[PDB]
Design a protein around this ligand. Structure first.
Ligand SMILES: [Ca+2]
Length: 245
């Protein structure tokens, strides 16, 4: 089904936030945070591209919301719980299972789990994600999570995903990562990607991709992306973190 906002649809972009799952787990470990079940075993996998998981799909600041004194910072911090609007219940990162069950179908839930290891169970990442980024738009949860799943697949199967797999555990350059993204998606769209790194030597933790709001329901092409000014904190080279701490 098509992902469509019922209200507040006047935003420019979605950010598809993809974790480099091994690096995410590495960063939580490095910062002495309580280990998550998704991370515990440091389980290896045949297609290393499968470590690129879905963190979320984040609408940008709606113009209606911006008009009420809400800036980017507030929007990023609170999403659907921004005051004075949309002012839906706050999603708490420390208590993700306190957010409502999303009502996603069992079929969608199982597909989601494959690419979002923290979905469901007593982890509930998808509850938190929908509460912060979807509930106030009235997104259909199946359409919303199905879209995340599809987009993640598209990235994974692209030259960008193959680059991560082919360079698993290695130091890569932004130059070469960008060339890989460009191969699939166009040189003009390299700047639609923000890369986040942690640690020293720095390793990849997240890939954020800016997509035109009006393009979200189409398979990704050179026309789907919204380049942005912020490349992220990864610097010129960084490590594609391997499973294990
Ligand atoms: Ca690691």
């Amino acid at each position: 089904l098509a992902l469509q906002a019922k209200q507040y649809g006047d935003f420019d972009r979605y950010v598809l936030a993809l974790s480099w799952q091994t690096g995410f787990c590495q960063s939580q470990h490095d910062r002495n945070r309580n280990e998550r079940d998704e991370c515990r075993l440091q389980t290896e996998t045949t297609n290393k591209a499968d470590f690129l998981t879905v963190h979320g799909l984040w609408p940008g600041l709606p113009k209606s919301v911006a008009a009420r004194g809400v800036d980017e910072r507030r929007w990023m911090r609170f999403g659907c719980a921004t005051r004075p609007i949309p002012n839906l219940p706050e999603a708490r990162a420390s208590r993700m299972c306190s957010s409502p069950e999303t009502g996603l179908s069992l079929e969608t839930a199982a597909k989601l789990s494959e690419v979002m290891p923290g979905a469901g169970g007593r982890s509930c990442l998808e509850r938190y994600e929908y509460a912060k980024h979807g509930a106030c738009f009235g997104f259909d949860p199946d359409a919303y999570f199905g879209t995340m799943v599809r987009l993640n697949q598209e990235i994974k199967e692209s030259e960008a995903g193959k680059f991560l797999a082919d360079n698993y555990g290695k130091t890569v350059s932004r130059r070469d990562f960008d060339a890989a993204f460009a191969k699939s998606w166009g040189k003009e769209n390299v700047k639609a990607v923000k890369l986040t790194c942690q640690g020293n030597p720095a390793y990849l933790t997240e890939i954020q991709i800016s997509i035109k709001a009006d393009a979200i329901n189409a398979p990704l092409s050179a026309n789907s992306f919204l380049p942005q000014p912020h490349p992220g904190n990864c610097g010129k080279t960084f490590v594609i973190d391997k499973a294990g701490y």
